[PDB]
Amino acid sequence: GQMSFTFASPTQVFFNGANVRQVDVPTQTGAFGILASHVPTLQVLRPGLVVVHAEDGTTSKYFVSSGSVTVNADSSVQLLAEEAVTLDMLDPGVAKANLEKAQSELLGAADEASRAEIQIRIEANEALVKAL
């Protein structure tokens, strides 16, 4: 109650000043739930789906890629994300194939930071399939 939820891509806007009681965000260092008076933090995101529960009967299943959640002192949040798409624009069939090919290059990485780049890529496709 008496909350404000803002959800904006760089090119488009989903929510402006319209809050619905519960926001589920995948944090880099875990996960949380916004109880509309949550103790305020400054967190950053991991690849994972955002399921905003509208009042409105049902929920809203978005899927962010990397953004920033700023819940602040007054009861108001500002969730800004880079690639915030829904579910139906994605195809599951291409997401299955992209996993094991990046696992195949993981053994074939000679350097230490180039192999660390491969570990970033397999994590994002892992949250891709399990969200589907």
Binding site: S65, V85, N98, I120, A124
Partner: peptide, 12 residues
């Protein structure tokens, strides 16, 4: 953030 957002543009 460049790599994990690039993978979403390949699964479209």
């Amino acid at each position: 953030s460049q790599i994990c957002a690039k993978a979403v543009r390949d699964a479209l």
